[PDB]
Amino acid sequence: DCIPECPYHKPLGFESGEVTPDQITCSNPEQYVGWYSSWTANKARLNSQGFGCAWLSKFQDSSQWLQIDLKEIKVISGILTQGRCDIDEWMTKYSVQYRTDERLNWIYYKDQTGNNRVFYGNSDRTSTVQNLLRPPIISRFIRLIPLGWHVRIAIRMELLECVSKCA
Amino acid sequence: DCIPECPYHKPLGFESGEVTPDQITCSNPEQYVGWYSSWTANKARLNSQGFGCAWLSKFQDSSQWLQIDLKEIKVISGILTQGRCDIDEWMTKYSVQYRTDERLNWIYYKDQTGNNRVFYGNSDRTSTVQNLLRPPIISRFIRLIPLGWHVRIAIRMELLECVSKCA
Amino acid sequence: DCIPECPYHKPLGFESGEVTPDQITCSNPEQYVGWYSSWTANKARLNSQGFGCAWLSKFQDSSQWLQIDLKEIKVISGILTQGRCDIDEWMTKYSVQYRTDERLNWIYYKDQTGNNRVFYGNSDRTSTVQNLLRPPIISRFIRLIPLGWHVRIAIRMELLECVSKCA
Amino acid sequence: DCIPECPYHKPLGFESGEVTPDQITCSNPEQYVGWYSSWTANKARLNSQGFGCAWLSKFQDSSQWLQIDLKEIKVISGILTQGRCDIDEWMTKYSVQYRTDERLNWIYYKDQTGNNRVFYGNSDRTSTVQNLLRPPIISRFIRLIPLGWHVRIAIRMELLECVSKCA
Amino acid sequence: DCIPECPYHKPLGFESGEVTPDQITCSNPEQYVGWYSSWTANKARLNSQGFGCAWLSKFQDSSQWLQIDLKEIKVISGILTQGRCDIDEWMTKYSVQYRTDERLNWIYYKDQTGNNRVFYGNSDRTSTVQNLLRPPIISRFIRLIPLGWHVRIAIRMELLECVSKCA
Amino acid sequence: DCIPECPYHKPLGFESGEVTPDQITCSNPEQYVGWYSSWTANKARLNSQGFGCAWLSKFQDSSQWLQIDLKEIKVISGILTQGRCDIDEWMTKYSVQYRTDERLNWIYYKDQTGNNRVFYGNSDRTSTVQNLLRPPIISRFIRLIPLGWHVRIAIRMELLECVSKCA
Amino acid sequence: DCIPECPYHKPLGFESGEVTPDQITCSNPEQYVGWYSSWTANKARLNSQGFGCAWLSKFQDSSQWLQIDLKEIKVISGILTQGRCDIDEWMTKYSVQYRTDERLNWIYYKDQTGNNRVFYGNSDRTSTVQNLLRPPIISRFIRLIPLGWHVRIAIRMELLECVSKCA
Amino acid sequence: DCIPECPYHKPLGFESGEVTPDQITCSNPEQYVGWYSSWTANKARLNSQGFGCAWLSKFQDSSQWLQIDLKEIKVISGILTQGRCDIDEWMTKYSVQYRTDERLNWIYYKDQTGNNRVFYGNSDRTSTVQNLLRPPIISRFIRLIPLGWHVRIAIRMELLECVSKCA
Numbered sequence A, B, C, D, E, F, G, H: 001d002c003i004p005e006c007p008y009h010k011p012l013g014f015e016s017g018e019v020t021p022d023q024i025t026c027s028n029p030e031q032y033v034g035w036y037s038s039w040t041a042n043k044a045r046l047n048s049q050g051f052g053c054a055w056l057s058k059f060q061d062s063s064q065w066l067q068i069d070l071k072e073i074k075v076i077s078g079i080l081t082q083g084r085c086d087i088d089e090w091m092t093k094y095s096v097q098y099r100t101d102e103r104l105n106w107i108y109y110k111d112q113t114g115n116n117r118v119f120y121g122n123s124d125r126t127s128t129v130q131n132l133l134r135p136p137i138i139s140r141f142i143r144l145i146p147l148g149w150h151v152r153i154a155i156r157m158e159l160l161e162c163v164s165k166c167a
Helices: none
Strands: A024-026 A066-082 A093-099 A118-120 A128-147 A156-161 B024-026 B066-082 B093-099 B118-120 B128-147 B156-161 C024-026 C066-082 C093-099 C118-120 C128-147 C156-161 D024-026 D066-082 D093-099 D118-120 D128-147 D156-161 E024-026 E066-082 E093-099 E118-120 E128-147 E156-161 F024-026 F066-082 F093-099 F118-120 F128-147 F156-161 G024-026 G066-082 G093-099 G118-120 G128-147 G156-161 H024-026 H066-082 H093-099 H118-120 H128-147 H156-161
Touching: A066 A093, A118 A128, A128 A156, B066 B093, B118 B128, B128 B156, C066 C093, C118 C128, C128 C156, D066 D093, D118 D128, D128 D156, E066 E093, E118 E128, E128 E156, F066 F093, F118 F128, F128 F156, G066 G093, G118 G128, G128 G156, H066 H093, H118 H128, H128 H156
Parallel strands: none
Antiparallel strands: A024 A066, A066 A128, A066 A156, A093 A118, A093 A128, B024 B066, B066 B128, B066 B156, B093 B118, B093 B128, C024 C066, C066 C128, C066 C156, C093 C118, C093 C128, D024 D066, D066 D128, D066 D156, D093 D118, D093 D128, E024 E066, E066 E128, E066 E156, E093 E118, E093 E128, F024 F066, F066 F128, F066 F156, F093 F118, F093 F128, G024 G066, G066 G128, G066 G156, G093 G118, G093 G128, H024 H066, H066 H128, H066 H156, H093 H118, H093 H128
């Protein structure tokens, strides 16, 4: 008929681990300037912990990000972000970018007249902030840029989609 | 069409004893550290009594739990917990975990922004607390962890589902 | 479609005498400890009188009851109780139990969080108390236990069901 | 679909005389103890007069009645009662009984919790009291017992049913 | 579907003269005791005048009437009455009787509990009083009895029915 | 389905001149007593002017009229009347009569209890008064009688009908 | 189904120039008494300017007009009028006439009881006045007569229709 | 069925770069009077920057514009305008023109009685102003004329359409 709201969100699976580690791409491909390559992508997942929480970033001047390569255009309804657990990290902002097809260039998340919006980070560590995105995000390659940093950035995340599903 | 609310709950059968004793799995597989192996799983069922109420746990530091192995992904609408009858036990909290397929790892019950919730235990023994779970729980293997303890934990339980059924 | 409320109740037939006397089972199978075997089951029926009202019970410490063996799982919408006519008997309480299939064990009537309810008896003799049961009772073998006693228990009863029927 | 209310009542025909005289049965089969056998059944019909109104009853201690033998289970929606015209007769009460099939025994009219009701008679003679019966009466053999008497009982009556009919 | 209200009334035709004169039957078959046989039935029709208005009646002690023989069971929705034009005649009352089939006996118009009603006549001559009858009158032979008289009775009339008709 | 109200009126055509002059019949067939035979029927049409407005009438004591012979039973929803233009003429009243089939006799316009109504004429000349007739007039031969006169009567008119039409 | 309101208006095309110049007919066929034949019909179109705005009229005593010959009966929903641009011209009134078929005679725009209406002209030059016509105008040949003049009349116009169209 | 509002807007793609550079036509075909031919059309796109923002215009007296040649009649629901980034530029107004078919002449955007509207420019540079156009613009060749200038005009833009799309 037409997309609804929704009524319920479908987590993709970062806690369940439906997503493969190969689809969590970290900025700094050298991984020695904006990462230590430890903590791994598997730690950078919602409620994943016990040996490191999040991904790390050695240098970061809001030109570091975390990408989710879905390799299929999917409809994303929200972005869950959770703090680390090593030491405290204060609220940041997010720039939501997405690209479909893995072609052309990237475009920005829009929300009303003004046509953009940044979402709040994690105020105090080891807690999840639920940033639901009202319009449906048609994305194949997602880029979540954390803007601002308390020392460095280190988030854990899971995406919410929507499957009707109905029973 | 789509899952409703519901309008009526369907007990699985712990009082009726539809569930086999083989599907009530207790933590501590040694059963001599977090159990005495007496009281049995049949006693640990809603309104089952006359020779022991609940399951016992010798040691427990909120790392003991009771699991319901359904061996079929079912839709759970509530968790009934009832106190023991030997001696008093005060309110505890619950962590609701579930896993489908008997694969991957376990995930947590979510309820709104903040994405978690713990449910209240039994305030005074030999009484049932009705903890209905608003969203439908898609689970094959259920883990109910009791958090906190008045000496030890010992609950009796039955699950509520939903069958339409209609007449 | 789905069960309604109802809009009208269908008496099974205890006054009409649709029920056979063979389906009214009295506690105390010895019938010389919790009965005199006079008054008979036919007297223990709604508005049946003229030679004894109700069934009698010599001893009773709330472990005497009256069962209706339907021998078919039926949907019961209410329990009518009427006092005796020999001498006065004051209000009692009822425990409503039912079992389907004539298998497993018995289960209790539930009504909201707390999951049980007892119904009021007959305040003053020779008068009918209409205890309607809001959810539909799926029962094959009904056990109505009278709790409390003014000397002894002695009730007359008829069940209400629901047939749509429509014209 | 289902019985309605109604919207209009259908008189059976006592004024029209659709009913045969053979279907108006009077109590006292001797007809010399609770009747004089004059006034006849044809006089005991709504608005029938000119040579005697109603049926008479010599003795009556509320164990005299008038029955309508329909010889077909019909749906009765009301009972019209009209006073006599010989001499005044004051309000009485009615007990409404009915039996279907011409088998088993008789059952009582029910109206709410308490499960019975008596209807008002004719306050002052030669006037009709419209006692509509809210639930549909499934009856084959109707017994209207007049309770109380100003000297004796003597009513004229017609039944109301319901045919949709629609045009 | 079912008879409506209506929304519009259909005059039978007394003004149009659809009705034959042979269907307007006057009381007093001698026509020399309760009529002069002049004024004729054609004058006794709504808005018929110029040589006598109405039908006359020499003697009348409310046992004179005017009948409409439809010779087909029709659904009558109202009775129009109009005064004469010779000399004044004051308000009377009407008893509405009808009979179907031209068999059995006659029955009375009913309106609510009390089961009867009389309608108002013409207050001052040469004016029409619209007496609509709320329930549909199933009649083949209509008898309109005028009760009371200012010297004598003399009305002009037309019946209203209902044809949907719809366009 | 059924006639509506309407929502829009359809002029027959007196201004357009759809009506033939042969269908506008004037009273006084001698045309030398209640007419001068000049002004012609073509002048007696809504907004027809330039050489005489309306039809004239030499003598008239409210027994002169203008008829529209439709020669087909049509549904008339209103009567437009417009004043003349030679000299002033004050408000009159109208009696609306109609006859179908060109058989039987004529009948009167009815509007509520009282069953008649007269419509207002033209207060001041050369202006149109819109007299809409709420119920649908089933007419083949229309007679509009002007009652009262300021010297004489002289109206111009057009009829309104209703065609759904819908687009 | 039936004509709507509308929801959107469809300009015919005078600005777009869908209308051919051959369909804009000016009064004064001599074109030397009520026109100079310069300004041309192409200038007399909504927002047409740059070398003369409107059509001119040398003499005009409200017996000059502009006609739109559609040569197809179309449904007109509004009349747009725009002022000239040479020198100021003050508000005028309009008489809206139309004729279908190019047969019979012309008829007037009606709006409620009183059956006519004139529309406002352009208060100050070079500005458009939107005169929407509530009922649908069934016209083949449109005549817009400007009544009153500030020196002379000179309007620019475009018609609004309605096409559903829907997407 | 019919065009909706919408519920969501579909950007054509100037940020995504769906539009080819060949469809962004700039006024001044000499490109040395009202342009420097640097900044290019690719810079004159919503959120395109890093080496020049917008298109430039050397001379401009509100007779310079930017056109979008769609080469297909499309339904445009809004015009996004964004400021430059070199130096500040203050709010301007817009004239929205469009032409379909690439034939006839151009027509103006209308909004209510008065039939035109200009939209607000960018108050302060490097910010987007969302000018949604309430009626659907049927256009093949779009001309956005900026009226007024703070030194010169230089806007970046993207169009919004509407695809239902529905999921």
